[PDB]
């Protein structure tokens, strides 16, 4: 009945802002889960940057890449919303810095560069997700072109469930060895675009790592988080939403509220 009451509350929340909410949440302490629309498809927007960063660290682990190698891009015309890469245009960035910047500031320039030189583009990102047993994730287009969030379009979609499972394998599981996993968590923990989402839903002495996404279209926005509650097993929370009309803006408070709902469902 915990589950059944959670679902009523998500459902009321989606009708209220005239839109569509997708939730999956995991207490690793118990295996307890809660999903609502947890197998429907939802645009990734920038949220794949979170996986992007994990792919880089996987390649560093494998020694196909060096975390401190210099990534020069001085001639590039940087994509809109590259606020870290603009500042190092002239001098370059270590790979590690570039990849965390993609993660923690949603730096599109960092993203496309990484996906063009190191990752095999959208298909290689999809390949990485497959390699950890994610059959839902698909990235189709490059950083700026994948936020059309057309209802019914499968390009650049995953499912809340897929997203959470994957976050679990990557953040908490055994995809990354100990040293590398630690860095991945630190990167998540320092994300700077997520204050009004899953972060706003948890006691202020919980530690959170997250990656957001904001399509700017169809009011589409998402967050997913690893949460370390005070003296208990980590939780995973995955929240995706969209809305009925192209012109609708996203809702931080809906994401925040749905997170609170999801966390009580599994608590
Ligand atoms: C991908 O979805 C997308 C990026 N990534 C974002 C994200 O992770 O949320 C979004 S929006 C996010 C909210 N603040 C930051 C920021 O750095 N700049 C900014 C720009 C306009 C308004 C505000 C504000 O009022 O705080 C903040 C961005 C972002 C659009 C794109 C690049 O595909």
Swiss-Prot record:
The active site is at residues 46, 145. Transmembrane segments: none annotated. Pfam families: Beta-lactamase2 (PF13354). The keyword Transferase does not apply. Keywords: Antibiotic resistance, Disulfide bond, Hydrolase, Signal. It comes from the Bacteria. Partially inhibited by the beta-lactamase-blocking agents, clavulanic acid and tazobactam. Not inhibited by EDTA. Its EC number is 3.5.2.6. It catalyses: a beta-lactam + H2O = a substituted beta-amino acid. GO terms for biological process: beta-lactam antibiotic catabolic process; response to antibiotic. GO terms for molecular function: beta-lactamase activity. Disulfide bonds join 45-215. Induction: Up-regulated by the carbapenem, imipenem. Expression probably regulated by upstream promoter elements. A beta-lactam binds at residues 46, 49, 106, 108, 212. NCBIfam families: bla_class_A, blaSME, classA_carba. Class A beta-lactamase which confers resistance to the beta-lactam antibiotics, including penicillins, some cephalosporins and carbapenems, to JM109 strain E.coli. Acts via hydrolysis of the beta-lactam ring. Has penicillin-, cephalosporin- and carbapenem-hydrolyzing activities. The class A beta-lactamase family has a specific amino-acid numbering system, sometimes called Ambler or ABL numbering and often misspelt as Amber. A multiple sequence alignment was used to derive a consensus sequence and then the consensus was numbered taking into account insertions and deletions. This allows use of identical numbers, e.g. for active site residues, despite differences in protein length. UniProt always uses natural numbering of residues, hence there appear to be differences in numbering between this entry and some papers. Belongs to the class-A beta-lactamase family. This is Beta-lactamase SME-1.
């Amino acid at each position: 009945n915990k589950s059944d009451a959670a679902a009523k509350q998500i459902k009321k929340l989606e009708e209220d802002f005239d839109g569509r909410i997708g939730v999956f949440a995991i207490d690793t302490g118990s295996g307890n889960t809660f999903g609502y629309r947890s197998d429907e498809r939802f645009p990734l927007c920038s949220s794949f940057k979170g996986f992007l960063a994990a792919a880089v660290l996987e390649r560093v682990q494998q020694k196909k890449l060096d975390i401190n190698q210099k990534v020069k891009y001085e001639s590039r015309d940087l994509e809109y919303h590259s606020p870290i890469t603009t500042k190092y245009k002239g001098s370059g960035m270590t790979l590690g810095d570039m990849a965390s910047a993609a993660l923690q500031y949603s730096d599109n320039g960092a993203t496309n560069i990484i996906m063009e030189r190191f990752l095999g583009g959208p298909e290689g990102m999809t390949k990485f997700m497959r390699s950890i047993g994610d059959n839902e994730f698909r990235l189709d287009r490059w950083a700026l072109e994948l936020n059309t969030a057309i209802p019914g379009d499968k390009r650049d979609t995953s499912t809340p469930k897929a997203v959470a499972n994957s976050l679990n394998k990557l953040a908490l599981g055994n995809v990354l060895n100990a040293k590398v996993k630690a860095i991945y968590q630190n990167w998540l923990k320092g994300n700077t675009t997520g204050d009004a989402r899953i972060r706003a839903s948890v006691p202020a002495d919980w530690v959170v790592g997250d990656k957001t996404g904001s399509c700017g279209a169809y009011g589409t926005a998402n967050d997913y988080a690893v949460i370390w509650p005070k003296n208990r097993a980590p939780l995973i929370v995955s929240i995706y939403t969209t809305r009925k009309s192209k012109d609708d803006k996203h809702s931080d408070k809906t994401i925040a509220e749905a997170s609170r709902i999801a966390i009580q469902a599994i608590d």
